[PDB]
Design a protein around this ligand. Structure first.
Ligand SMILES: C[C@@H](N)C(=O)N[C@H](CCC(=O)N[C@@H](CCC[C@@H](N)C(=O)O)C(=O)N[C@H](C)C(=O)O)C(=O)O
Ligand SMILES: C[C@@H](N)C(=O)N[C@H](CCC(=O)N[C@@H](CCC[C@@H](N)C(=O)O)C(=O)N[C@H](C)C(=O)O)C(=O)O
Ligand SMILES: [Zn+2]
Ligand SMILES: [Zn+2]
Lengths: 243, 243
Protein backbone atom coordinates (compact mmCIF):
# COMPACT_ATOMS: atom_id res chain seq x y z
CA UNK A 1 0.00 0.00 0.00
CA UNK A 2 2.87 0.27 -0.80
CA UNK A 3 6.45 0.38 0.47
CA UNK A 4 9.07 -2.28 0.94
CA UNK A 5 10.30 -3.98 -2.25
CA UNK A 6 7.36 -6.41 -2.99
CA UNK A 7 8.50 -8.77 -5.71
CA UNK A 8 6.40 -10.04 -8.56
CA UNK A 9 6.71 -13.83 -8.55
CA UNK A 10 4.02 -14.59 -11.14
CA UNK A 11 6.57 -15.75 -13.75
CA UNK A 12 9.21 -18.47 -13.58
CA UNK A 13 11.77 -19.35 -16.20
CA UNK A 14 11.86 -22.75 -17.89
CA UNK A 15 15.56 -22.39 -18.74
CA UNK A 16 17.37 -23.02 -15.48
CA UNK A 17 19.13 -25.85 -13.69
CA UNK A 18 21.32 -26.61 -10.69
CA UNK A 19 24.20 -24.57 -9.37
CA UNK A 20 25.86 -27.92 -8.52
CA UNK A 21 27.72 -29.15 -11.61
CA UNK A 22 30.35 -31.51 -10.07
CA UNK A 23 30.89 -34.06 -7.30
CA UNK A 24 34.39 -34.21 -5.80
CA UNK A 25 35.69 -37.22 -3.83
CA UNK A 26 38.22 -36.97 -1.01
CA UNK A 27 39.75 -38.97 1.84
CA UNK A 28 40.17 -37.55 5.34
CA UNK A 29 43.70 -38.86 6.10
CA UNK A 30 42.56 -39.38 9.72
CA UNK A 31 40.26 -41.29 12.12
CA UNK A 32 36.48 -40.62 12.23
CA UNK A 33 36.19 -38.45 15.34
CA UNK A 34 39.17 -36.34 14.33
CA UNK A 35 37.82 -36.17 10.75
CA UNK A 36 34.52 -34.83 12.07
CA UNK A 37 36.34 -32.28 14.25
CA UNK A 38 38.30 -30.93 11.30
CA UNK A 39 35.31 -30.83 8.96
CA UNK A 40 33.11 -29.06 11.50
CA UNK A 41 35.53 -26.69 13.32
CA UNK A 42 38.71 -26.54 11.16
CA UNK A 43 38.28 -24.16 8.22
CA UNK A 44 37.63 -26.89 5.69
CA UNK A 45 34.36 -28.74 5.28
CA UNK A 46 32.44 -31.08 3.03
CA UNK A 47 28.80 -31.85 2.42
CA UNK A 48 29.04 -35.55 3.25
CA UNK A 49 31.37 -37.71 5.31
CA UNK A 50 31.41 -41.52 4.97
CA UNK A 51 32.50 -43.32 8.08
CA UNK A 52 34.61 -46.44 8.52
CA UNK A 53 31.94 -48.41 10.42
CA UNK A 54 29.88 -51.34 9.01
CA UNK A 55 27.43 -50.37 7.59
CA UNK A 56 29.28 -47.12 6.83
CA UNK A 57 27.43 -44.14 8.31
CA UNK A 58 26.91 -41.14 6.02
CA UNK A 59 27.02 -37.82 7.82
CA UNK A 60 25.57 -34.69 6.29
CA UNK A 61 27.68 -31.76 7.52
CA UNK A 62 26.76 -28.98 5.06
CA UNK A 63 23.41 -28.55 3.27
CA UNK A 64 23.69 -29.08 -0.48
CA UNK A 65 22.45 -25.52 -1.09
CA UNK A 66 25.50 -24.11 0.70
CA UNK A 67 29.16 -23.83 -0.32
CA UNK A 68 31.42 -26.24 1.55
CA UNK A 69 35.17 -25.67 1.58
CA UNK A 70 36.73 -28.78 0.10
CA UNK A 71 38.17 -28.12 -3.38
CA UNK A 72 40.40 -25.09 -2.93
CA UNK A 73 42.38 -23.98 -5.98
CA UNK A 74 40.86 -26.24 -8.61
CA UNK A 75 39.80 -26.66 -12.22
CA UNK A 76 37.73 -29.18 -14.18
CA UNK A 77 36.58 -28.81 -17.82
CA UNK A 78 37.58 -25.14 -17.70
CA UNK A 79 35.53 -24.42 -14.55
CA UNK A 80 37.75 -22.96 -11.81
CA UNK A 81 37.31 -22.60 -8.06
CA UNK A 82 34.94 -25.54 -7.80
CA UNK A 83 33.58 -25.13 -4.22
CA UNK A 84 30.70 -22.92 -5.37
CA UNK A 85 29.60 -25.39 -8.06
CA UNK A 86 30.32 -28.75 -6.40
CA UNK A 87 29.27 -31.19 -3.73
CA UNK A 88 32.21 -32.53 -1.70
CA UNK A 89 32.26 -36.06 -0.30
CA UNK A 90 34.87 -37.11 2.22
CA UNK A 91 35.67 -40.73 3.11
CA UNK A 92 37.33 -41.79 6.38
CA UNK A 93 40.58 -43.38 5.23
CA UNK A 94 44.17 -42.94 6.37
CA UNK A 95 45.29 -41.90 2.87
CA UNK A 96 49.03 -42.42 2.64
CA UNK A 97 51.83 -42.70 5.12
CA UNK A 98 55.49 -41.91 4.39
CA UNK A 99 57.83 -44.68 5.53
CA UNK A 100 61.63 -45.14 5.30
CA UNK A 101 60.97 -47.74 2.60
CA UNK A 102 58.54 -45.51 0.71
CA UNK A 103 54.96 -44.21 0.52
CA UNK A 104 52.20 -46.68 1.50
CA UNK A 105 48.43 -46.49 0.90
CA UNK A 106 45.42 -47.80 2.85
CA UNK A 107 42.50 -49.56 1.21
CA UNK A 108 38.80 -48.54 1.31
CA UNK A 109 36.23 -50.88 2.86
CA UNK A 110 33.44 -52.53 0.88
CA UNK A 111 30.90 -51.01 3.29
CA UNK A 112 32.13 -47.51 2.37
CA UNK A 113 31.72 -48.21 -1.33
CA UNK A 114 28.22 -49.61 -0.71
CA UNK A 115 27.30 -46.38 1.10
CA UNK A 116 28.96 -44.20 -1.56
CA UNK A 117 27.31 -45.66 -4.68
CA UNK A 118 23.67 -45.01 -3.63
CA UNK A 119 24.66 -41.57 -2.26
CA UNK A 120 26.23 -40.63 -5.62
CA UNK A 121 23.26 -41.91 -7.62
CA UNK A 122 20.93 -39.84 -5.47
CA UNK A 123 23.01 -36.65 -5.74
CA UNK A 124 23.59 -37.12 -9.49
CA UNK A 125 19.93 -37.66 -10.27
CA UNK A 126 18.75 -34.67 -8.24
CA UNK A 127 21.33 -32.27 -9.77
CA UNK A 128 21.66 -33.71 -13.27
CA UNK A 129 25.32 -34.60 -12.84
CA UNK A 130 26.86 -36.72 -15.57
CA UNK A 131 29.55 -39.33 -15.01
CA UNK A 132 32.36 -37.17 -16.40
CA UNK A 133 31.68 -34.64 -13.63
CA UNK A 134 32.07 -37.08 -10.71
CA UNK A 135 35.81 -36.75 -10.06
CA UNK A 136 38.59 -36.83 -7.49
CA UNK A 137 40.40 -34.04 -5.75
CA UNK A 138 43.46 -35.25 -7.61
CA UNK A 139 41.75 -34.60 -11.00
CA UNK A 140 40.96 -31.00 -10.15
CA UNK A 141 44.19 -30.19 -8.31
CA UNK A 142 46.80 -32.41 -9.94
CA UNK A 143 50.13 -32.57 -8.17
CA UNK A 144 48.81 -30.58 -5.22
CA UNK A 145 46.35 -33.22 -4.02
CA UNK A 146 46.52 -36.97 -4.39
CA UNK A 147 43.19 -38.04 -2.84
CA UNK A 148 41.33 -40.32 -3.13
CA UNK A 149 44.50 -42.06 -4.28
CA UNK A 150 45.61 -45.19 -6.19
CA UNK A 151 43.57 -47.63 -4.09
CA UNK A 152 40.25 -45.88 -4.63
CA UNK A 153 37.97 -48.32 -6.52
CA UNK A 154 37.01 -46.18 -9.50
CA UNK A 155 35.98 -49.31 -11.40
CA UNK A 156 33.29 -50.09 -8.82
CA UNK A 157 31.79 -46.63 -9.49
CA UNK A 158 32.07 -47.22 -13.23
CA UNK A 159 30.26 -50.56 -12.94
CA UNK A 160 27.38 -48.57 -11.36
CA UNK A 161 27.44 -46.09 -14.25
CA UNK A 162 28.84 -43.20 -12.20
CA UNK A 163 32.25 -42.47 -13.75
CA UNK A 164 33.84 -43.01 -17.16
CA UNK A 165 35.82 -46.19 -17.72
CA UNK A 166 37.16 -47.89 -20.88
CA UNK A 167 34.64 -50.35 -22.33
CA UNK A 168 35.71 -53.97 -22.60
CA UNK A 169 38.37 -54.44 -25.27
CA UNK A 170 38.87 -50.73 -25.91
CA UNK A 171 42.27 -50.36 -24.25
CA UNK A 172 43.54 -53.18 -26.49
CA UNK A 173 42.00 -51.62 -29.61
CA UNK A 174 43.58 -48.21 -28.92
CA UNK A 175 46.96 -49.77 -28.21
CA UNK A 176 46.67 -51.40 -31.66
CA UNK A 177 45.81 -48.01 -33.19
CA UNK A 178 49.01 -46.42 -31.84
CA UNK A 179 50.98 -49.37 -33.17
CA UNK A 180 54.11 -48.85 -31.06
CA UNK A 181 54.36 -45.13 -31.84
CA UNK A 182 54.47 -42.98 -28.70
CA UNK A 183 52.78 -39.63 -29.34
CA UNK A 184 54.70 -36.46 -28.46
CA UNK A 185 54.24 -34.51 -25.24
CA UNK A 186 52.01 -31.92 -26.92
CA UNK A 187 49.57 -34.70 -27.90
CA UNK A 188 49.40 -35.89 -24.27
CA UNK A 189 48.72 -32.30 -23.18
CA UNK A 190 45.97 -32.00 -25.79
CA UNK A 191 44.33 -35.25 -24.66
CA UNK A 192 44.46 -34.37 -20.96
CA UNK A 193 42.83 -30.98 -21.62
CA UNK A 194 40.09 -32.73 -23.61
CA UNK A 195 39.32 -34.99 -20.66
CA UNK A 196 39.06 -31.91 -18.43
CA UNK A 197 42.47 -31.41 -16.81
CA UNK A 198 44.19 -28.07 -16.43
CA UNK A 199 47.51 -28.71 -18.16
CA UNK A 200 50.13 -26.70 -20.01
CA UNK A 201 50.15 -26.70 -23.82
CA UNK A 202 53.89 -26.07 -24.23
CA UNK A 203 54.88 -29.39 -25.77
CA UNK A 204 57.51 -29.68 -22.98
CA UNK A 205 57.52 -32.31 -20.25
CA UNK A 206 58.06 -30.24 -17.13
CA UNK A 207 56.81 -30.88 -13.60
CA UNK A 208 53.48 -29.16 -14.27
CA UNK A 209 52.70 -31.58 -17.11
CA UNK A 210 54.19 -34.63 -15.41
CA UNK A 211 51.89 -34.03 -12.42
CA UNK A 212 48.80 -34.11 -14.67
CA UNK A 213 49.86 -37.22 -16.53
CA UNK A 214 50.48 -38.76 -13.10
CA UNK A 215 47.04 -37.79 -11.79
CA UNK A 216 45.40 -39.43 -14.84
CA UNK A 217 47.56 -42.56 -14.31
CA UNK A 218 46.75 -42.65 -10.60
CA UNK A 219 43.08 -43.02 -11.56
CA UNK A 220 43.21 -45.19 -14.68
CA UNK A 221 46.61 -46.97 -14.47
CA UNK A 222 47.55 -46.94 -10.76
CA UNK A 223 50.27 -49.58 -11.12
CA UNK A 224 52.52 -46.69 -12.17
CA UNK A 225 51.73 -43.00 -11.83
CA UNK A 226 55.09 -41.26 -12.08
CA UNK A 227 53.79 -39.07 -14.91
CA UNK A 228 56.10 -40.55 -17.54
CA UNK A 229 54.38 -40.79 -20.94
CA UNK A 230 54.07 -44.37 -22.23
CA UNK A 231 52.00 -46.33 -24.74
CA UNK A 232 49.53 -47.69 -22.21
CA UNK A 233 48.81 -44.18 -20.94
CA UNK A 234 48.33 -42.88 -24.50
CA UNK A 235 45.97 -45.76 -25.15
CA UNK A 236 43.95 -44.91 -22.03
CA UNK A 237 43.76 -41.26 -23.03
CA UNK A 238 42.02 -42.52 -26.20
CA UNK A 239 39.96 -45.31 -24.63
CA UNK A 240 38.53 -43.52 -21.58
CA UNK A 241 35.16 -42.00 -22.63
CA UNK A 242 34.28 -38.32 -22.09
CA UNK A 243 30.71 -39.15 -21.08
CA UNK B 1 12.92 -50.67 2.81
CA UNK B 2 14.24 -47.13 2.18
CA UNK B 3 13.12 -43.71 0.93
CA UNK B 4 16.73 -42.79 0.03
CA UNK B 5 20.22 -42.87 1.55
CA UNK B 6 20.10 -42.69 5.35
CA UNK B 7 21.86 -39.59 6.61
CA UNK B 8 23.16 -38.74 10.06
CA UNK B 9 22.59 -35.05 10.71
CA UNK B 10 23.95 -34.93 14.31
CA UNK B 11 26.66 -32.48 13.33
CA UNK B 12 27.13 -29.30 11.34
CA UNK B 13 30.15 -27.40 10.06
CA UNK B 14 31.13 -23.80 10.93
CA UNK B 15 33.13 -23.65 7.72
CA UNK B 16 30.50 -22.77 4.99
CA UNK B 17 29.00 -19.85 3.08
CA UNK B 18 26.94 -19.08 -0.03
CA UNK B 19 27.35 -20.62 -3.47
CA UNK B 20 26.53 -17.12 -4.81
CA UNK B 21 29.71 -15.09 -4.96
CA UNK B 22 28.87 -12.49 -7.66
CA UNK B 23 26.02 -10.30 -8.93
CA UNK B 24 26.03 -9.58 -12.69
CA UNK B 25 24.11 -6.67 -14.19
CA UNK B 26 22.61 -6.67 -17.68
CA UNK B 27 20.22 -4.76 -19.87
CA UNK B 28 17.62 -6.61 -21.96
CA UNK B 29 17.94 -4.75 -25.30
CA UNK B 30 14.18 -5.03 -25.63
CA UNK B 31 10.81 -3.95 -24.14
CA UNK B 32 9.04 -5.38 -21.10
CA UNK B 33 6.84 -8.06 -22.71
CA UNK B 34 9.64 -9.55 -24.83
CA UNK B 35 12.11 -9.33 -21.95
CA UNK B 36 9.76 -11.41 -19.81
CA UNK B 37 9.20 -13.83 -22.67
CA UNK B 38 12.81 -14.38 -23.62
CA UNK B 39 13.95 -14.70 -20.04
CA UNK B 40 11.26 -17.31 -19.25
CA UNK B 41 11.20 -19.48 -22.39
CA UNK B 42 13.72 -18.10 -24.87
CA UNK B 43 16.70 -20.30 -24.00
CA UNK B 44 18.23 -17.90 -21.44
CA UNK B 45 17.18 -16.56 -18.03
CA UNK B 46 18.03 -14.32 -15.09
CA UNK B 47 17.03 -14.23 -11.44
CA UNK B 48 15.57 -10.74 -11.45
CA UNK B 49 14.13 -8.45 -14.08
CA UNK B 50 13.56 -4.74 -13.43
CA UNK B 51 10.73 -3.27 -15.47
CA UNK B 52 10.44 0.16 -17.05
CA UNK B 53 7.26 1.23 -15.28
CA UNK B 54 6.98 3.84 -12.49
CA UNK B 55 7.63 2.71 -9.85
CA UNK B 56 9.63 -0.07 -11.46
CA UNK B 57 8.34 -3.59 -10.92
CA UNK B 58 10.94 -6.20 -9.95
CA UNK B 59 10.20 -9.72 -11.14
CA UNK B 60 11.83 -12.77 -9.64
CA UNK B 61 12.06 -15.29 -12.47
CA UNK B 62 14.53 -17.88 -11.12
CA UNK B 63 14.91 -18.82 -7.43
CA UNK B 64 18.22 -17.64 -5.97
CA UNK B 65 19.22 -21.24 -5.17
CA UNK B 66 19.00 -22.17 -8.87
CA UNK B 67 21.32 -21.56 -11.81
CA UNK B 68 19.97 -18.99 -14.28
CA UNK B 69 21.49 -18.74 -17.77
CA UNK B 70 22.70 -15.14 -18.12
CA UNK B 71 26.52 -14.92 -17.99
CA UNK B 72 27.65 -17.39 -20.63
CA UNK B 73 31.38 -17.51 -21.31
CA UNK B 74 32.69 -15.37 -18.52
CA UNK B 75 35.43 -14.74 -16.01
CA UNK B 76 35.91 -12.57 -12.95
CA UNK B 77 38.82 -12.67 -10.48
CA UNK B 78 39.86 -15.96 -12.06
CA UNK B 79 36.44 -17.58 -11.58
CA UNK B 80 35.07 -18.88 -14.89
CA UNK B 81 31.62 -19.87 -16.15
CA UNK B 82 29.93 -17.59 -13.69
CA UNK B 83 26.29 -18.76 -14.01
CA UNK B 84 26.67 -21.36 -11.25
CA UNK B 85 28.06 -18.87 -8.76
CA UNK B 86 26.15 -15.70 -9.66
CA UNK B 87 22.81 -13.94 -9.44
CA UNK B 88 21.84 -12.18 -12.67
CA UNK B 89 19.78 -9.02 -12.77
CA UNK B 90 18.41 -7.71 -16.06
CA UNK B 91 17.04 -4.20 -16.56
CA UNK B 92 14.50 -3.35 -19.25
CA UNK B 93 16.39 -0.99 -21.52
CA UNK B 94 16.75 -0.80 -25.31
CA UNK B 95 20.55 -0.86 -25.18
CA UNK B 96 22.11 0.98 -28.11
CA UNK B 97 21.45 1.88 -31.70
CA UNK B 98 24.03 2.19 -34.45
CA UNK B 99 24.26 5.50 -36.29
CA UNK B 100 26.75 6.83 -38.83
CA UNK B 101 28.04 9.19 -36.12
CA UNK B 102 28.52 6.18 -33.84
CA UNK B 103 26.88 3.99 -31.23
CA UNK B 104 24.25 5.66 -29.05
CA UNK B 105 22.75 4.22 -25.89
CA UNK B 106 19.43 4.72 -24.11
CA UNK B 107 19.32 6.00 -20.53
CA UNK B 108 18.03 4.18 -17.46
CA UNK B 109 15.05 5.64 -15.63
CA UNK B 110 15.17 7.02 -12.11
CA UNK B 111 12.54 4.48 -11.04
CA UNK B 112 14.76 1.61 -12.18
CA UNK B 113 17.77 2.77 -10.21
CA UNK B 114 15.59 3.41 -7.15
CA UNK B 115 14.41 -0.22 -7.41
CA UNK B 116 17.85 -1.66 -8.17
CA UNK B 117 19.78 -0.21 -5.24
CA UNK B 118 17.67 -1.71 -2.46
CA UNK B 119 17.53 -5.04 -4.31
CA UNK B 120 21.33 -5.15 -4.54
CA UNK B 121 21.76 -4.25 -0.85
CA UNK B 122 19.33 -7.07 0.07
CA UNK B 123 21.01 -9.72 -2.09
CA UNK B 124 24.50 -8.62 -1.04
CA UNK B 125 23.63 -8.76 2.66
CA UNK B 126 21.99 -12.19 2.43
CA UNK B 127 24.82 -13.76 0.42
CA UNK B 128 27.78 -11.82 1.79
CA UNK B 129 28.69 -10.40 -1.61
CA UNK B 130 31.46 -7.82 -1.46
CA UNK B 131 31.41 -4.66 -3.61
CA UNK B 132 34.16 -5.86 -5.93
CA UNK B 133 31.90 -8.77 -7.01
CA UNK B 134 28.89 -6.68 -8.10
CA UNK B 135 29.83 -6.23 -11.74
CA UNK B 136 28.55 -5.80 -15.28
CA UNK B 137 28.31 -8.31 -18.06
CA UNK B 138 30.93 -6.20 -19.83
CA UNK B 139 33.38 -6.79 -16.95
CA UNK B 140 33.15 -10.58 -17.16
CA UNK B 141 32.90 -10.80 -20.97
CA UNK B 142 34.90 -7.78 -22.23
CA UNK B 143 34.51 -7.07 -25.88
CA UNK B 144 31.84 -9.77 -26.29
CA UNK B 145 29.26 -7.93 -24.17
CA UNK B 146 28.81 -4.19 -23.56
CA UNK B 147 25.88 -4.18 -21.10
CA UNK B 148 24.99 -2.38 -18.86
CA UNK B 149 26.84 0.16 -20.99
CA UNK B 150 28.26 3.71 -20.64
CA UNK B 151 25.03 5.24 -19.28
CA UNK B 152 24.81 2.92 -16.28
CA UNK B 153 25.15 5.10 -13.18
CA UNK B 154 27.93 3.24 -11.36
CA UNK B 155 28.77 6.10 -8.96
CA UNK B 156 25.18 5.95 -7.58
CA UNK B 157 25.85 2.31 -6.62
CA UNK B 158 29.21 3.38 -5.20
CA UNK B 159 27.56 6.07 -3.08
CA UNK B 160 25.34 3.30 -1.63
CA UNK B 161 28.43 1.23 -0.83
CA UNK B 162 27.77 -1.43 -3.53
CA UNK B 163 30.74 -1.08 -5.91
CA UNK B 164 34.36 0.12 -5.58
CA UNK B 165 35.01 3.74 -6.50
CA UNK B 166 37.90 6.13 -5.94
CA UNK B 167 37.79 8.15 -2.69
CA UNK B 168 37.68 11.88 -3.29
CA UNK B 169 41.20 13.22 -3.96
CA UNK B 170 42.66 9.81 -4.79
CA UNK B 171 42.45 10.18 -8.56
CA UNK B 172 44.43 13.40 -8.14
CA UNK B 173 46.95 11.68 -5.84
CA UNK B 174 47.52 9.03 -8.52
CA UNK B 175 47.65 11.38 -11.49
CA UNK B 176 50.40 13.24 -9.61
CA UNK B 177 52.37 10.01 -8.96
CA UNK B 178 52.33 9.22 -12.68
CA UNK B 179 53.94 12.58 -13.38
CA UNK B 180 52.92 12.72 -17.03
CA UNK B 181 54.54 9.39 -17.82
CA UNK B 182 52.32 6.80 -19.49
CA UNK B 183 52.98 3.28 -18.20
CA UNK B 184 53.60 0.59 -20.80
CA UNK B 185 50.99 -1.82 -22.08
CA UNK B 186 52.17 -4.69 -19.90
CA UNK B 187 51.59 -2.48 -16.86
CA UNK B 188 48.01 -1.89 -18.03
CA UNK B 189 47.51 -5.66 -18.42
CA UNK B 190 48.91 -6.32 -14.93
CA UNK B 191 46.61 -3.77 -13.35
CA UNK B 192 43.54 -5.01 -15.22
CA UNK B 193 44.16 -8.59 -14.08
CA UNK B 194 44.48 -7.36 -10.48
CA UNK B 195 41.07 -5.72 -10.84
CA UNK B 196 39.62 -9.04 -11.93
CA UNK B 197 39.57 -8.94 -15.74
CA UNK B 198 40.60 -11.74 -17.99
CA UNK B 199 43.34 -10.11 -20.07
CA UNK B 200 46.49 -11.15 -21.96
CA UNK B 201 49.95 -10.58 -20.41
CA UNK B 202 51.81 -10.19 -23.70
CA UNK B 203 52.83 -6.54 -23.41
CA UNK B 204 51.18 -5.93 -26.78
CA UNK B 205 48.11 -3.79 -27.46
CA UNK B 206 46.09 -6.06 -29.74
CA UNK B 207 42.28 -6.29 -29.91
CA UNK B 208 41.95 -8.61 -26.90
CA UNK B 209 43.74 -6.12 -24.60
CA UNK B 210 42.10 -3.08 -26.13
CA UNK B 211 38.66 -4.64 -25.45
CA UNK B 212 39.52 -5.05 -21.76
CA UNK B 213 40.92 -1.51 -21.40
CA UNK B 214 37.69 -0.39 -23.07
CA UNK B 215 35.46 -2.33 -20.72
CA UNK B 216 37.23 -0.74 -17.73
CA UNK B 217 36.90 2.72 -19.34
CA UNK B 218 33.24 2.15 -20.11
CA UNK B 219 32.63 1.72 -16.39
CA UNK B 220 34.90 4.38 -14.81
CA UNK B 221 35.58 6.82 -17.68
CA UNK B 222 32.62 6.53 -20.07
CA UNK B 223 33.47 9.75 -21.99
CA UNK B 224 35.90 7.60 -24.00
CA UNK B 225 36.12 3.80 -24.02
CA UNK B 226 38.05 3.12 -27.23
CA UNK B 227 40.55 0.98 -25.29
CA UNK B 228 43.48 3.30 -25.88
CA UNK B 229 45.80 3.63 -22.88
CA UNK B 230 46.02 7.12 -21.42
CA UNK B 231 47.09 8.84 -18.22
CA UNK B 232 43.57 9.17 -16.88
CA UNK B 233 42.94 5.44 -17.32
CA UNK B 234 46.27 4.65 -15.60
CA UNK B 235 45.30 6.88 -12.67
CA UNK B 236 41.91 5.14 -12.40
CA UNK B 237 43.57 1.69 -12.42
CA UNK B 238 45.54 2.83 -9.35
CA UNK B 239 42.76 4.85 -7.68
CA UNK B 240 39.94 2.37 -8.00
CA UNK B 241 40.42 0.17 -5.00
CA UNK B 242 40.77 -3.61 -5.01
CA UNK B 243 37.75 -4.97 -3.20
C1 LIG C 1 38.24 -31.02 2.48
C2 LIG C 1 39.66 -31.20 2.84
N1 LIG C 1 40.14 -32.49 2.62
C3 LIG C 1 40.47 -30.03 2.34
O1 LIG C 1 41.27 -29.68 3.13
N2 LIG C 1 40.35 -29.29 1.13
C4 LIG C 1 41.08 -28.08 0.88
C5 LIG C 1 39.95 -27.09 0.69
C6 LIG C 1 40.29 -25.70 1.00
C7 LIG C 1 39.19 -24.74 0.56
O2 LIG C 1 38.40 -24.94 -0.24
N3 LIG C 1 39.20 -23.52 1.23
C8 LIG C 1 38.29 -22.51 0.94
C9 LIG C 1 38.40 -21.42 1.98
C10 LIG C 1 39.77 -20.80 1.98
C11 LIG C 1 39.83 -19.68 2.99
C12 LIG C 1 41.04 -18.79 2.83
N4 LIG C 1 42.21 -19.55 3.10
C13 LIG C 1 41.06 -18.20 1.44
O3 LIG C 1 41.97 -18.48 0.67
O4 LIG C 1 40.16 -17.43 1.09
C14 LIG C 1 38.64 -21.90 -0.40
O5 LIG C 1 39.66 -22.14 -0.95
N5 LIG C 1 37.71 -20.99 -0.91
C15 LIG C 1 37.94 -20.28 -2.12
C16 LIG C 1 38.03 -18.82 -1.74
C17 LIG C 1 36.86 -20.46 -3.17
O6 LIG C 1 36.33 -21.54 -3.29
O7 LIG C 1 36.56 -19.50 -3.90
C18 LIG C 1 42.02 -27.93 -0.31
O8 LIG C 1 41.85 -28.37 -1.41
O9 LIG C 1 43.03 -27.27 -0.20
C1 LIG D 1 20.40 -13.52 -20.30
C2 LIG D 1 20.91 -12.85 -21.53
N1 LIG D 1 21.16 -11.54 -21.26
C3 LIG D 1 21.98 -13.60 -22.32
O1 LIG D 1 21.68 -13.72 -23.45
N2 LIG D 1 23.20 -14.21 -21.87
C4 LIG D 1 24.03 -15.01 -22.72
C5 LIG D 1 24.36 -16.34 -22.02
C6 LIG D 1 23.33 -17.35 -21.85
C7 LIG D 1 23.91 -18.54 -21.09
O2 LIG D 1 24.50 -18.45 -20.10
N3 LIG D 1 23.68 -19.78 -21.63
C8 LIG D 1 24.08 -20.98 -21.02
C9 LIG D 1 23.72 -22.13 -21.92
C10 LIG D 1 22.26 -22.31 -22.05
C11 LIG D 1 21.97 -23.63 -22.72
C12 LIG D 1 20.92 -23.49 -23.77
N4 LIG D 1 21.60 -22.94 -24.88
C13 LIG D 1 20.32 -24.85 -24.05
O3 LIG D 1 21.00 -25.87 -23.88
O4 LIG D 1 19.14 -24.98 -24.45
C14 LIG D 1 25.55 -21.19 -20.79
O5 LIG D 1 26.35 -20.63 -21.44
N5 LIG D 1 25.89 -22.13 -19.80
C15 LIG D 1 27.21 -22.49 -19.53
C16 LIG D 1 27.41 -23.80 -20.22
C17 LIG D 1 27.53 -22.57 -18.06
O6 LIG D 1 27.18 -21.67 -17.33
O7 LIG D 1 28.20 -23.51 -17.65
C18 LIG D 1 25.45 -14.58 -23.08
O8 LIG D 1 26.20 -14.08 -22.29
O9 LIG D 1 25.91 -14.98 -24.14
ZN1 LIG E 1 40.75 -33.64 -0.97
ZN1 LIG F 1 24.25 -9.25 -20.46
Amino acid sequence: MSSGPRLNTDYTSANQDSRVQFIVLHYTSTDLPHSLGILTHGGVSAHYLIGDDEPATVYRLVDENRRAWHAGVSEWQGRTWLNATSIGIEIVNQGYRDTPQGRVWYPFSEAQIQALIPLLKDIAKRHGITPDRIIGHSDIAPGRKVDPGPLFPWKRLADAGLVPWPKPGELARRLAELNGQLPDVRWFQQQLARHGYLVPQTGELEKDTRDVIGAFQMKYRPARFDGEPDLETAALLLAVPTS
